Design a protein around this motif. Structure first.
Motif, mmCIF file in Angstrom:
data_model
loop_
_atom_site.group_PDB
_atom_site.id
_atom_site.type_symbol
_atom_site.label_atom_id
_atom_site.label_comp_id
_atom_site.label_asym_id
_atom_site.label_seq_id
_atom_site.Cartn_x
_atom_site.Cartn_y
_atom_site.Cartn_z
ATOM 1 N N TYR A 38 -7.340 73.511 38.567
ATOM 2 C CA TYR A 38 -6.832 74.183 37.600
ATOM 3 C C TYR A 38 -6.354 73.187 36.327
ATOM 4 O O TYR A 38 -6.527 71.868 36.474
ATOM 5 N N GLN A 40 -3.968 73.308 33.404
ATOM 6 C CA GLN A 40 -2.569 73.841 32.957
ATOM 7 C C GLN A 40 -2.282 73.054 31.585
ATOM 8 O O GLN A 40 -2.025 71.808 31.408
ATOM 9 N N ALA A 45 -0.431 79.162 30.720
ATOM 10 C CA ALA A 45 -0.850 79.335 32.011
ATOM 11 C C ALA A 45 -1.848 78.523 32.509
ATOM 12 O O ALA A 45 -2.415 77.877 31.740
ATOM 13 N N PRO A 46 -2.038 78.655 33.713
ATOM 14 C CA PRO A 46 -3.195 77.781 34.591
ATOM 15 C C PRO A 46 -4.565 77.677 34.290
ATOM 16 O O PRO A 46 -5.062 76.515 34.183
#
Lengths: 216, 216
Positions: A38, A40, A45-46
């Motif tokens: 991911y 971030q 958000a991710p």
């Protein structure tokens, strides 16, 4: 809980690279092939970028890669863009339908050109005035890096009350944006020649002024 | 792709139960029961607290409830603790690979009284407009908790291009202050009747609207 050993950093440079590691345990990384990364961004958000060792979402820049060996996995950001300053997270399935995440890595780019803030001084809205308030902003925009100081002046001997500056934010470009307000009253507004905003960044100041005369 | 929408700020005394909603539309979130919730504290990793609508991983308290009607997931922290304070994200899998995230809620255990923001919008200064620049800036101050949603609409229709918010910051008075701007070509300033700056902060949504003037 159990946090797949990630290094706490990784400084690269624009058109160099950066590879990171996610250190697991048979389940994590080693055990199953369900290790995903991911991206971030500060207070956002991710964004799932790598999923499932080698695979990569419907739109993610192929310069990123996973490279699982055994119990450790790698993510490869080649040819750094300033964009890539973020906290990459890793994870891997571990049976029982539970997934497990890895500590985090702050990933950084050295060799980004420095920029001096664009300073914008608003006078109070007529509409606002109509209401009998008198707020004033120093939009402090596009600076690199985000260390700046703001000081307000009433034609001379500085303003040090009812001022509220913000901490710089990361901003679309990989540059900053800060704010600075002055809560005046209309009297106060119309009881001074000029109101200044004086902003200091890497040795270079900028001073903007406003006079009660957008027009009238 | 991209995002599911979640309310920007959850708040509860402590003991008080807080719900968090995550809504989407048609593609992805619907007859799409893959929805997971992530909790996330400070600078620490996104930790799955609910999965597949409502299965919790039992390292997890039962007061974490999961619920999904029509186009809307939910998450009830059924009896708040200090340690519930965090950013909570939602996830939905657009089959094959669009791990579409939500915007995130910020669950606040209540210190200060709750305070809905005061949004003063500022239009392009006269000078500014002389300088062949065009910039609007929406100041948002005195809000607690430190979460909001900001948005820009030109003549009602959301103006996507070139907006820039800041994260909340603390004032001398413990409440927050966030700034959001826009940059334009002065022509495109004067090609619309209005421009609306629009700030959401838990129920209280406030809209302001600037309209083009020429000092002469």
């Amino acid at each position: 809980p159990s946090a797949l050993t990630q290094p706490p950093s990784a400084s690269g440079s624009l058109g160099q690279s950066v590879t990171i590691s996610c250190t697991g345990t048979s389940s994590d990384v080693g055990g199953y092939n369900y290790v995903s990364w991911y991206q971030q961004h500060a207070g956002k958000a991710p964004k799932v970028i790598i999923y499932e060792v080698n695979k990569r979402p419907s739109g993610v820049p192929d310069r990123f890669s996973g490279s699982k060996s055994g119990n450790t996995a790698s993510l490869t950001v080649s040819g750094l863009q300033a964009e890539d300053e973020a906290d990459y997270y890793c994870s891997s399935y571990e049976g029982s339908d539970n997934f497990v995440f890895g500590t985090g890595t702050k990933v950084t780019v050295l060799g980004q050109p420095k920029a001096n803030p664009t300073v914008t001084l608003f006078p109070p809205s007529s509409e606002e005035l109509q209401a009998n308030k008198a707020t004033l902003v120093c939009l402090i925009s596009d600076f690199y890096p985000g260390a700046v100081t703001v000081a307000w002046k009433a034609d001379g001997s500085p303003v040090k009350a009812g001022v509220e500056t913000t901490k710089p934010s990361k901003q679309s470009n990989n540059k900053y944006a800060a704010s600075s307000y002055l809560s005046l009253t209309p009297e106060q507004w119309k009881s001074h020649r000029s109101y200044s905003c004086q902003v200091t960044h890497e040795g270079s100041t900028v001073e903007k002024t406003v006079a009660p005369t957008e027009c009238s």
